[PDB]
Amino acid sequence: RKLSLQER
Amino acid sequence: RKLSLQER
Amino acid sequence: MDKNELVQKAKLAEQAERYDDMAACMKSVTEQGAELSNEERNLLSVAYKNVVGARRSSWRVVSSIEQKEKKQQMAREYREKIETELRDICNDVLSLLEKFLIPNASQAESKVFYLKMKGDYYRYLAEVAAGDDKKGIVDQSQQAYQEAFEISKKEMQPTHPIRLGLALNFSVFYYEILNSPEKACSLAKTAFDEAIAELDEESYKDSTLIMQLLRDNLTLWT
Amino acid sequence: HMDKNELVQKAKLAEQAERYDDMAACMKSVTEQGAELSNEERNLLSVAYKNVVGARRSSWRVVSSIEQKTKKQQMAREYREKIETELRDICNDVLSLLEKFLIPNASQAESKVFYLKMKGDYYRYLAEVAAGDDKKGIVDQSQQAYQEAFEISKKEMQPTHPIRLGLALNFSVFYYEILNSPEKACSLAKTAFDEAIAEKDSTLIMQLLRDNLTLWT
């Protein structure tokens, strides 16, 4: 998964 | 799905 | 820019999912003048099928938005932008076919492969044609499929995966472009049966799954 | 000028068509008309560029993997550096939109924090592939943008504002991944989680904060 925030 | 050959 | 450098950067581009890159690499390979190995041929076909596949999908999204005001004129202009991209790609492939690929195919199986590609990209042009322009496109696709079909009948087993892929896309052409379910079903069914009678390795998964493919289309068309 | 209404319409279209370079060009024109951006506009710009830079970061990670697991190795290095050049161009494009239009014009605190957070994100993405002399400078830019945004976010926003929470998340990731400071990263994440404990949007970002803390320990 993504460490950083979901903004896509 | 689509009906045509799926050529990855 | 050697053939094999380009083939390797092409394989990297594929893994990276940068398909415009991969296609440009394989285009360079092709323009180098020489016949394409099975490896190259397949890398070419994959690259351009993804490049065009993205535009085909985008086109679909924006058409079906345009069919549901100044927003409607936005959708129209944007669809035409995508259309010009798609058309330019298709004609790129078709030039590559006429200039290098088809006039160099010493393997009969490759000659079938390339004519089927030609059928396919005229088919994609035909999905979006609008006018008296469209008949000539449809005729080019149908004639290229028929040439491929013809040759595959002399030089190929009914179980051969290129012969069956050619049969699937030909039948889809009849269904989607000529709106003719009877010819679509006949061609599909004839190919499935001439295959299921001759199964008697190592490309098995291909044949069978194309056969599954053929079956599926039949089920949705009958 | 062009019609910003049209531009926002095209960019919603481009989004649905999965054409994010298009989406970014539309929203960048919108931005280049010099007005403050509404909230819808703000988010469509950020989403567009998140995706544009995202495809390249993915491609870079994947080609790096291949390069380090292999003549072939050297062509994988050239390819990586091409993706890198592309990525730097996207990142400086965004960053100069932030410095030239967005940040100067931001009326509220909410927007100023959002935009400086973005500034931190894109200097971070530059850092992920930066040389090493022109890399400490890039890291510093990211740090200070995050810092500025952090202070403001303390003053004008509850510990529960999803924008301050997302800012804490990305700033902590900055400490972990870029500065290599699992300590500073873990304290920052937790201090933000515990401060958001007292005072369902923010919960998502809070869960992400926790998952990261668990993985880092």
Side-chain angles (χ1 to χ4, degrees), chain A residues 1-5 7-8, chain B residues 2-8, chain C residues 1-4 6-66 70-200 203-204 206-219 221-222, chain D residues 1-3 5-9 11-70 73-111 113-153 156-183 185-189 191-198 201-217:
Chain A
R1 58 172 196 76
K2 190 194 281 277
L3 293 214
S4 65
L5 193 86
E7 313 175 68
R8 279 174 82 162
Chain B
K2 275 293 220 43
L3 325 160
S4 79
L5 189 75
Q6 282 324 310
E7 330 207 20
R8 333 318 271 292
Chain C
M1 299 275 284
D2 54 89
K3 219 147 81 208
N4 265 119
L6 294 163
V7 163
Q8 252 59 46
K9 264 183 120 202
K11 297 176 109 315
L12 279 163
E14 181 183 16
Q15 305 197 262
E17 301 213 57
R18 303 169 46 97
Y19 286 107
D20 292 27
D21 269 6
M22 174 189 201
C25 299
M26 285 328 288
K27 174 152 171 220
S28 270
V29 178
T30 300
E31 301 178 312
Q32 255 180 50
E35 171 150 22
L36 255 61
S37 99
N38 285 320
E39 164 150 74
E40 289 149 320
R41 181 240 269 169
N42 298 322
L43 285 176
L44 180 50
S45 168
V46 167
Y48 273 111
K49 190 85 160 43
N50 280 271
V51 168
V52 79
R55 275 59 166 210
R56 288 173 72 217
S57 163
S58 281
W59 189 95
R60 257 173 262 122
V61 156
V62 163
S63 265
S64 100
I65 282 167
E66 186 184 22
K70 190 97 172 224
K71 208 197 110 148
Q72 210 145 225
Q73 164 188 22
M74 297 302 109
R76 186 177 67 250
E77 258 154 353
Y78 198 41
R79 155 175 68 68
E80 270 148 2
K81 196 219 189 101
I82 296 160
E83 250 190 68
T84 291
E85 269 181 38
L86 190 154
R87 172 173 301 108
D88 292 359
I89 285 151
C90 286
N91 278 315
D92 191 33
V93 171
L94 290 174
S95 325
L96 284 184
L97 287 164
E98 286 323 288
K99 183 151 137 138
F100 295 111
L101 296 179
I102 282 166
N104 267 349
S106 49
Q107 327 313 123
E109 143 179 348
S110 286
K111 208 108 178 174
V112 176
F113 188 91
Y114 288 156
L115 297 182
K116 154 167 166 329
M117 256 186 83
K118 171 157 171 170
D120 288 343
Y121 285 85
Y122 276 111
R123 187 167 38 96
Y124 310 148
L125 276 176
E127 289 179 339
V128 317
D132 321 288
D133 214 28
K134 165 166 182 174
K135 286 188 288 273
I137 280 141
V138 166
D139 285 355
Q140 290 287 324
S141 174
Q142 157 145 263
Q143 155 199 335
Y145 286 135
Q146 193 74 49
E147 231 200 306
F149 191 81
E150 212 81 295
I151 300 202
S152 92
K153 273 207 281 199
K154 309 190 56 83
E155 319 237 5
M156 269 159 177
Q157 210 67 14
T159 37
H160 195 301
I162 297 180
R163 169 143 176 204
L164 290 157
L166 169 57
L168 178 66
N169 284 9
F170 206 166
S171 96
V172 162
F173 164 78
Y174 278 126
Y175 192 82
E176 274 170 359
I177 313 291
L178 286 190
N179 279 326
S180 148
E182 288 76 1
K183 309 195 218 233
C185 296
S186 278
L187 195 151
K189 189 248 204 61
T190 300
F192 180 88
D193 296 343
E194 301 191 0
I196 205 49
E198 299 207 14
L199 280 173
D200 45 15
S203 74
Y204 210 34
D206 301 344
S207 279
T208 57
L209 62 80
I210 297 176
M211 301 193 51
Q212 270 143 67
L213 291 196
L214 290 166
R215 159 88 259 123
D216 292 314
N217 286 6
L218 285 175
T219 285
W221 297 345
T222 45
Chain D
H1 270 316
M2 226 198 301
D3 193 348
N5 316 127
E6 293 194 27
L7 287 179
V8 171
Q9 290 166 8
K12 299 190 204 113
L13 285 179
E15 194 186 12
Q16 296 258 311
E18 304 279 314
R19 288 171 66 99
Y20 290 100
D21 295 44
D22 277 356
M23 205 195 175
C26 287
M27 292 314 296
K28 166 191 212 217
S29 311
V30 167
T31 287
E32 288 174 352
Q33 326 203 289
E36 228 184 319
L37 289 185
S38 69
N39 304 285
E40 217 200 21
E41 300 171 335
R42 205 234 284 143
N43 277 126
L44 286 170
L45 171 73
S46 147
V47 153
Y49 268 113
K50 258 299 177 319
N51 273 270
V52 163
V53 84
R56 270 66 165 196
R57 284 163 84 218
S58 166
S59 301
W60 184 93
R61 285 184 171 117
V62 155
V63 169
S64 301
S65 205
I66 288 161
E67 171 191 22
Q68 54 194 239
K69 294 200 236 288
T70 60
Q73 183 204 287
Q74 289 145 326
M75 292 297 210
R77 184 173 67 214
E78 318 193 44
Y79 199 46
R80 199 193 79 236
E81 281 172 0
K82 183 212 218 147
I83 307 162
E84 258 161 37
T85 288
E86 222 179 276
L87 212 160
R88 293 184 166 104
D89 176 314
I90 285 146
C91 283
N92 293 114
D93 184 24
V94 155
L95 281 170
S96 54
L97 284 177
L98 288 156
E99 269 338 294
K100 282 198 307 212
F101 297 84
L102 304 179
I103 293 164
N105 277 350
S107 62
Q108 266 205 38
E110 202 189 286
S111 279
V113 165
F114 185 99
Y115 286 140
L116 278 150
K117 185 186 143 323
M118 259 180 101
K119 180 162 161 164
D121 291 344
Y122 280 86
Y123 270 118
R124 183 161 53 95
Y125 306 141
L126 276 172
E128 282 171 346
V129 308
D133 226 349
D134 171 65
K135 155 145 202 290
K136 288 149 161 340
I138 272 156
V139 171
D140 262 341
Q141 317 246 56
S142 175
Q143 198 264 343
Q144 279 138 41
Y146 280 132
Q147 199 54 67
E148 222 153 319
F150 208 31
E151 299 158 6
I152 302 148
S153 82
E156 271 84 43
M157 282 189 291
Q158 312 89 285
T160 58
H161 203 314
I163 288 159
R164 172 204 190 159
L165 263 200
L167 156 67
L169 172 61
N170 283 12
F171 204 178
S172 87
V173 180
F174 171 77
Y175 275 121
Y176 203 78
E177 265 192 60
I178 320 290
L179 266 202
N180 296 302
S181 314
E183 321 88 21
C186 285
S187 35
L188 192 166
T191 291
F193 185 78
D194 292 330
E195 278 176 12
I197 280 302
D201 263 328
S202 306
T203 87
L204 207 156
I205 303 90
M206 263 172 297
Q207 263 305 145
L208 268 275
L209 269 180
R210 168 169 261 147
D211 290 354
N212 291 2
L213 271 178
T214 61
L215 154 62
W216 293 338
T217 50

